[PDB]
Amino acid sequence: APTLTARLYSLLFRRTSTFALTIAVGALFFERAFDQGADAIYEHINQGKLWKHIKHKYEN
């Protein structure tokens, strides 16, 4: 039975064109995911300080 990594190699990693396709799509989704996650981390660390948190009290 092929493992997950063996399936990854055969499907994508073997031919460098599919390897680069994996790289680029992962880059797009990883940019999205990491930016979202780290922004959440920093906002939590500074919850209640950042202007975005307190903008409502003074707008409108």
Binding site: A20, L21, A24, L28, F29, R32
Partner: protein, 51 residues
């Protein structure tokens, strides 16, 4: 240029067309990602969450 109009060169073109298409796909995705082309990206799920 007449040198490359033969059956064997047609066969080589057939062999390399899928790989060339994959390289073109890589280039298109790279361009969209690097420039954050919203025209294409906005249709992409969970990436449309940005902007």
């Amino acid at each position: 240029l007449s040198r490359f109009l033969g059956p064997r060169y047609r066969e080589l073109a057939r062999n390399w067309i899928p790989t060339a298409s994959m390289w073109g796909a890589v280039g298109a995705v790279g361009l969209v990602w690097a420039t954050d082309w919203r025209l294409i990206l906005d249709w992409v799920p969970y990436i449309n969450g940005k902007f």
